Structure 1
Amino acid sequence: SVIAGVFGALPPHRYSQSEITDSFVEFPGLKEHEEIIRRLHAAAKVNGRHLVLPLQQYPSLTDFGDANEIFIEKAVDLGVEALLGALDDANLRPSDIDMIATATVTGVAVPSLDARIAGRLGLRPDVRRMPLFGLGSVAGAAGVARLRDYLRGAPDDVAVLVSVELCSLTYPAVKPTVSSLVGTALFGDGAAAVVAVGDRRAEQVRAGGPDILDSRSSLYPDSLHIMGWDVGSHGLRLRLSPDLTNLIERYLANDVTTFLDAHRLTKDDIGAWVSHPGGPKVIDAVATSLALPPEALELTWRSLGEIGNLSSASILHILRDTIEKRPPSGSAGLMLAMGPGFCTELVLLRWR
């Protein structure tokens, strides 16, 4: 399992953070909350976000069915763009793909995104499909890890993960509640794709990106309420408990120590950290938990600032950033994500 390509895609409509806010407080039913909205938006540490729709169109997006239908169309466009890009980076072709996995939590599609995506790209009719849905924000790391699991038993194959998250589209379910307003300060739209190859196929594809060495999932007891969707007539409504950061602060070290002990590594042996940008308070929690220097998580901070929180797609944008800035050849890399479960996922990388 060696990564051969990584690529991120973004919708063309980009808006500065306060632009978004300036219009948002004026949306129907939101002006009674200008103050908490401005505060929450200014404290998100996001400087701009890409929106799959013109900012001016969101107030009229009140029907879940309308929103989901648009999701299905845009999601497939962006996912195709990402996959095509990651294949370019790997210098590979659609026909070479033996297994495709898709991750999203922001739309409901049957047939799944992989069926549609594979239809658009002219993938082998016999390609193996794997649509993950319930995973959310953790599916970027967990998805890379599922690639390894597959390629571990299929050493000559090529596998891809595609992650599309169009968070702006969940708007119909947004209420002037604290947890939904937090989601309104953090989340943006985007996609990302990873092309990965088996051990036997790496050398003759000239697979560049890092090896995928291992992963470990960590599912916390009695924590369903930390992250989720309240699903209904209104669509997909965010559940976000305050206890989230406290959870990370109390258990994240053990997740990390248990996994690295297994490889006889310490936190110090990590050459590059690739963390999910849940938001200021969550990034702080990770740094505090693992006692990391301000520079360890700077590419995730940077990511949060430039494109916001992209659910599962963010950890892959950041991963691409990390690859570009060429970490020490042969050093360890750690992917660290968290999502609905509650769970965390850790992936072990080795930079080339």
Structure 2
Amino acid sequence: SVIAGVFGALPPHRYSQSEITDSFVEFPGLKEHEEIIRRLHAAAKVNGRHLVLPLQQYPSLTDFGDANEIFIEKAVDLGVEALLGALDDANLRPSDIDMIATATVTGVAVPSLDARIAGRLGLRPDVRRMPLFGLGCVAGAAGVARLRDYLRGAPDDVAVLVSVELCSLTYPAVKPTVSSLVGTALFGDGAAAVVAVGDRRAEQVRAGGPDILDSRSSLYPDSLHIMGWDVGSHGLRLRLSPDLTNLIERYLANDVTTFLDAHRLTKDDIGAWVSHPGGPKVIDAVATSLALPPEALELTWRSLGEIGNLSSASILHILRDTIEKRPPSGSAGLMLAMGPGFCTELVLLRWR
């Protein structure tokens, strides 16, 4: 399988980190925690973020019903904008799509996003639907792996992954507890789409982006608590452990090497790293444990600073960013993501 188009889409409201913090500190029930909020927002190394709602609308977003409704309205059109952009990058059409995978962790939609996006964009009624929910930040790498897994048995097919993460809209569940504030410093809104295509279909559509060669999921034992949501009446509340960093440093190099040994490869044999940004400590951790030079994660740091942590869609934004960089032809690309599980997901890429 080979990527034919990537496309990130963001809501048009872009705010500075400063503008967001300055306003956020003045939100109901928050002024008291200004010190830690500024600390956390500054330490986040996010310089700005696209929000789906005008910044000053958030204090009014206290109801999970409203929020999740706005999510469904906004997720789909961010999703279709993303999909179309990738469809056009692949010079393909909605009718060309044979399967659609949808990745979100930040909203609950039944009928799922894929159903609604497929409605909007006029996909064939018999598109295969794969609504992925609960992969979280890992869903961008994992979604790409699942496309491979699909196209592997359907060489003529077009399979799309649409990630939409509207982190902002989980605001109803946000309280001045440090974990929620950590998330309030890092997470922004945005969608992204990957149009992938089978090997046979590849030459017909002049498929540009990288070949998706292989993936390896890595579920860590006894680590449910590391990451995820505590779901409740006030909605999706971030659970996020400080232990996470130490899981990376202990075990990521192991995942990255066992997967790379399977391909007669090394750390140095990879031409562009495509890493999810949990936040700076996370980026430092994978950089440190994988003994990565500064340049290797620069795009994901740049993406972090430009649009923040978009969860699933992040790794697909920096994948789109790294594609535009045009890295060495035929060189190994390595998607690395991680999320609730706790798990990590390596995806072996090959660039053109």
User: What TM-score, normalized to structure 1?
Assistant: 1.00
Q: Shift of the alpha carbon at 1:290?
A: 0.6
Q: Is 1:37 paired with 2:58?
A: no
Q: Shift of the alpha carbon at 1:74?
A: 0.3
How far apart, in 1, do the equivalents of 2:135 and 2:72 lie? 18
Q: Shift of the alpha carbon at 1:236?
A: 0.6
Q: Shift of the alpha carbon at 1:111?
A: 0.2
Q: Shift of the alpha carbon at 1:160?
A: 0.2
Q: Which runs of 5+ in 1 are unaligned?
A: none
**What do residues 187-215 of structure 1 show as CA deviations (whole Å, max 9, x unaligned)?**
00000000010011100110011111000
Q: Shift of the alpha carbon at 1:57?
A: 0.6
How far apart, in 2, do the equivalents of 1:52 and 1:78 lie? 9
How far apart, in 2, do the equivalents of 1:242 and 1:272 lie? 28
How far apart, in 1, do the equivalents of 2:323 and 2:235 lie? 37
Q: Shift of the alpha carbon at 1:333?
A: 0.5
How far apart, in 1, do the equivalents of 2:255 and 2:36 lie? 35
Secondary structure at 2:294 match in 1: coil
Q: Shift of the alpha carbon at 1:132?
A: 0.3
How far apart, in 1, do the equivalents of 2:82 and 2:7 lie? 6
Q: Shift of the alpha carbon at 1:258?
A: 0.2
Q: Shift of the alpha carbon at 1:344?
A: 0.1
Q: Is 1:160 paired with 2:160?
A: yes
Q: Shift of the alpha carbon at 1:345?
A: 0.2
> Which residue of structure 2 lines up, in the alignment, with residue 344 of structure 1?
344
**What do residues 254-285 of structure 1 show as CA deviations (whole Å, max 9, x unaligned)?**
00000000011000100000000111000000
Q: Shift of the alpha carbon at 1:182?
A: 0.2
Q: Is 1:75 paired with 2:75?
A: yes
How far apart, in 2, do the equivalents of 1:175 and 1:141 lie? 30
Q: Shift of the alpha carbon at 1:31?
A: 1.1
How far apart, in 1, do the equivalents of 2:264 and 2:232 lie? 47
Secondary structure at 1:237 match in 2: strand
Q: Shift of the alpha carbon at 1:60?
A: 0.8
Q: Shift of the alpha carbon at 1:64?
A: 0.6
Q: Shift of the alpha carbon at 1:44?
A: 0.3
Q: Shift of the alpha carbon at 1:228?
A: 1.1
**What do residues 112-152 of structure 1 show as CA deviations (whole Å, max 9, x unaligned)?**
00000000000101110000001000000000000000000
1:287-306 pair list within 5 angstroms = 287-306=287-306
How far apart, in 2, do the equivalents of 1:157 and 1:72 lie? 28
How far apart, in 2, do the equivalents of 1:34 and 1:326 lie? 42
Secondary structure at 1:108 match in 2: coil
**What do residues 35-75 of structure 1 show as CA deviations (whole Å, max 9, x unaligned)?**
11110111000000000000111001111101000000000
> Which residue of structure 2 lines up, in the alignment, with residue 272 of structure 1?
272
**Size of the alignment, in residue pairs?**
352
How far apart, in 2, do the equivalents of 1:232 and 1:293 lie? 42
How far apart, in 2, do the equivalents of 1:316 and 1:49 lie? 16
Q: Shift of the alpha carbon at 1:23?
A: 0.8
- Flag as ranges the 4+ runs of structure 1 deviating above 3 A: none
Secondary structure at 1:216 match in 2: strand
Secondary structure at 1:341 match in 2: coil
Q: Shift of the alpha carbon at 1:32?
A: 1.1
> Which residue of structure 2 lines up, in the alignment, with residue 132 of structure 1?
132
**What do residues 66-92 of structure 1 show as CA deviations (whole Å, max 9, x unaligned)?**
100000000001000000000000000
Secondary structure at 2:38 match in 1: helix
How far apart, in 1, do the equivalents of 2:6 and 2:228 lie? 28
Secondary structure at 2:88 match in 1: helix
**What do residues 214-261 of structure 1 show as CA deviations (whole Å, max 9, x unaligned)?**
000000000000001111111110100110100001000000000000
Secondary structure at 1:268 match in 2: coil
**What do residues 3-34 of structure 1 show as CA deviations (whole Å, max 9, x unaligned)?**
00000100000100011011111111101111
**What do residues 302-322 of structure 1 show as CA deviations (whole Å, max 9, x unaligned)?**
000000000000000000111
How far apart, in 2, do the equivalents of 1:225 and 1:254 lie? 21
Q: Shift of the alpha carbon at 1:159?
A: 0.4
How far apart, in 2, do the equivalents of 1:141 and 1:287 lie? 18
How far apart, in 2, do the equivalents of 1:228 and 1:84 lie? 30
> Which residue of structure 1 lines up, in the alignment, with residue 20 of structure 2?
20
> Which residue of structure 1 lines up, in the alignment, with residue 6 of structure 2?
6
How far apart, in 1, do the equivalents of 2:85 and 2:317 lie? 13
State, as a whole percentage, how many aligned pairs show the same letter. Answer: 100
RMSD: 0.5
